[PDB]
Design a protein around this ligand. Structure first.
Ligand code: U2F
Ligand code: U2F
Lengths: 450, 452
């Protein structure tokens, strides 16, 4: 029976999430409903396009709906709160209202597209209230939810002025999917603090008489397509650089420029490597790629400027006439080129302060030449650390521990690099993006609808 | 006869800078004494530290932490330095700083007095010691005393903002001879003096104010061209020889100075940005290296400009950098002067664009250091005192970042014939007015004065 996916952004006629949604839709046949974000004329029909099994369908938002829904409540209350940064939340009631109003707009426009024996799969924190809004319009359907980001423990979550409403609305889903067991446990603990919840099958619950199930589905990667892209011919100037850096090892990071990512702390870790391991001077380099994300907002502009300052400071202290220790690039690179960069790099530095999963970590390992692989240094606060147990796991709050991991990665024998890489690769191959989506859809299909 | 020189720092035998070679040439001809602050804080009780080699004696004292803060960090570097560099917005006048400034000048005069002899000629250097002739006169010293100001002297509209400008002018007139880097500095001093009090002037350079006789003169400081050429032609240290060879297909734009707000370093970085933006043919084929050792890092305005500069390095490299190409190499590090001559030689462009500079020896070093048969190009701010004499440089206005960018492009593509012609003309000017000439003229003029 049909699959209806809804997600805040979509891609028409790719990246980690899109390939999982596309696979679920290919097997079932369906429709992918979401925003096509450029505002300006909300009052037109849905922009519909069709392949064969599936139809994309998109809508626009007013500049008020966008400021209050996405720029304010999603990106400046939920995003900071869920990544353990209450000091960064910017709660204002007109923004909570706008959040509900937009979830209600989206539900009005989705109602007519739905059919009775459909299955519905909602994605991420922008749409916490969405199932509630569907139940109010009479849709009884199997609806599942997947949260891509962390779910915070009670002491953090309960600080949100509207936490009790958010919890009530989330129990309108039949299935709630999370990246890790601790996220699933945190949600249940928040729920248990507000109201009595009855459990009976490890993962089948009741609360306020509403029935639902929880489960862990750690999002994954397409390892064959990554390996293919990574292995392809370097564009000329990158072939030049690789043969120029024969004796220089490369430590590489890429991510969206976001405060969850701990980029300043990462620069400090590299500084500590340079400070305490002078053997490496002139023979390593750290390259951070960090394109500007949501630069319209103060917390993000603050980190960009801090990174500029820190690149300058660190290079100014440790640099030489013929050696720049830190390459900081505030630029977007194509996913395909990045896979090649991962392969040619010697160490992958993925140390966010808090991350739902972090695909870069999985991508980095998939892209390696398995005969000569690089080493993953990974933060224990990334959700990928629960499975990538053979990465060098570190606490980014201890810059010297991060530095010692980097030193160890830089000196690691081929035998140990193979052993560690092959162990992580086996794990990402077995829980691949195809596996992720199939597990969630099969669980969702099992639920008897109300 | 015997020369006594005082300056805020001195240099005992065991890395000789530009001013130091001038002073030493002076002292080696006359014999004499070099007296000044040791650079050390603490233990000011203990005797003067004296060393002697042949004809010369070096003598230093320590200062107390409070003396240093008020006299050096505050008044010298937070009032006089920003005011004389046309930065009223950075002056931090407070009365305790001024009293400290006078207290330290008096103290140095007290420590110097027992060491003087009747026939000594006395040469005082720089803005730290504006009151020093005055302190010497009230201690009964009748000797010929000359002053040289190494930095610009600002016009009345700026100088007169200093709450103590009047006392400064009165004290400067107790020198028998006052020397300046440029004619505009000399004139600005005289203009300030004429606005306070009636000055009688004969033949442009001989003056009376308040019944006190003194002379003024211009002595643009220079370099030792033959020593620089020797140093510059010497082999690079192996790691740097390797580097020069690896950069065959890369033109180097080079700059070096103290990390000071007078030097216009952010405006310079902005000019390089404009080069990279508007002249993309240079991408991957040029490099701009800025050497900028921290200077006076206890002073708030200096920490500010350092943080501003770091931000701009990161921003610019963040925007124009590539995986295999960093456009801007910023090094907050001191380099030995001898090594720098060699780096100037292998470089293709010298970028010296201060917002205000008494002279700027780096500009003169740069030209002297070039291979005259394959010379680099100097891009020079019209606001360095050096621009008065380095007329064949590519002269630019740093307030117009696109003009600086165009001069960098012009420098990067200049034919060998034009580079030789410009270089030879500049080199001739700096050979005819070298550091030996500078000190010999100052000393000759000072011996001429009839002591009170
Ligand atoms: O310049 C660039 C920069 C990045 N990329 C790609 O962006 C993706 C980054 O995904 P990643 O999961 O590591 O981080 P994230 O952006 O926070 O997404 C959230 O959602 C993810 C999905 O569940 C979850 O893993 C994560 O913890 C969430 F916070 C990854 O596929 C990169 O290759 C790129 O193509 N070019
Ligand atoms: O890392 C480094 C950085 C610099 N140097 C050397 O320091 C000297 C800088 O002298 P320069 O005259 O260019 O500037 P400045 O520091 O302001 O000195 C003042 O006084 C100078 C003398 O009258 C006058 O030209 C100037 O306008 C005044 F502001 C020059 O000889 C460089 O080669 C170095 O050896 N290592």
């Amino acid at each position: 029976s049909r699959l209806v996916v809804v997600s805040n952004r979509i891609a028409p006629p790719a990246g980690g999430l899109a390939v999982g949604i596309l696979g679920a839709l290919k097997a079932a046949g369906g429709l992918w409903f979401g925003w096509s974000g450029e505002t300006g004329n909300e009052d037109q029909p849905l922009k519909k396009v069709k392949k064969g099994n599936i139809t994309w369908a998109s809508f626009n938002l007013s500049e008020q709906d966008l400021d209050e829904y996405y720029n304010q409540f999603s990106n400046a209350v939920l995003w900071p709160a869920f990544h353990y940064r209450l000091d960064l939340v910017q709660f204002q009631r007109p923004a909570w209202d706008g959040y509900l109003r937009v979830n209600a707009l989206l539900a009005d426009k989705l109602l007519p597209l739905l059919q009775d024996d459909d299955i519905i799969w909602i994605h991420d924190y922008h749409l916490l209230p969405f199932a509630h809004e569907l139940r109010k319009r009479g849709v009884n359907n199997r609806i599942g939810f997947f949260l891509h980001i962390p779910f915070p423990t009670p002491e953090i979550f309960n600080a949100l002025p509207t936490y009790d409403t958010l919890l009530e609305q989330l129990c309108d889903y039949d299935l709630l999917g999370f990246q890790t067991e601790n996220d699933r446990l945190a949600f249940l603990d928040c729920l248990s603090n507000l109201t009595r919840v009855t459990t009976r099958s490890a993962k089948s619950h009741t609360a306020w008489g509403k029935a639902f199930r929880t489960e862990v589905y750690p999002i994954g990667i397409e390892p064959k397509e990554i390996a293919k892209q990574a292995a392809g011919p370097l564009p000329p100037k990158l072939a030049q650089l690789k043969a120029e850096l024969k004796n220089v090892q490369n430590i590489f990071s890429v991510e969206r420029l976001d405060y969850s990512k701990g980029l300043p702390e990462r620069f400090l870790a590299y500084e500590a490597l340079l400070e305490k391991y002078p053997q490496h001077h002139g023979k390593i380099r750290y390259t951070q790629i960090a394109p500007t994300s949501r630069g319209d907002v103060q917390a993000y502009q603050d980190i960009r400027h801090q990174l500029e300052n820190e690149a300058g400071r660190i290079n100014g202290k440790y640099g030489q006439l013929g050696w720049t220790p830190l390459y900081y690039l505030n630029q977007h690179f194509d996913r395909k080129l990045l896979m090649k960069i991962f392969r040619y790099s010697d160490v992958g530095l993925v140390t966010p302060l808090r991350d739902g999963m972090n695909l870069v970590a999985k991508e980095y390992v998939a892209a390696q030449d398995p005969a000569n692989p690089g080493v993953l240094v990974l933060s224990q606060f990334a959700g990928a650390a629960n499975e990538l147990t053979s990465a060098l796991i570190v606490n980014p709050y201890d810059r010297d521990e991060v530095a010692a991991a980097l030193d160890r990665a830089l000196t690691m024998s081929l035998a140990e690099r193979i052993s560690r890489h092959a162990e992580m690769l086996d794990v990402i191959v077995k829980n691949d993006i195809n596996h992720w989506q199939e597990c969630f859809i099969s669980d969702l299909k099992q639920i008897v609808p109300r």
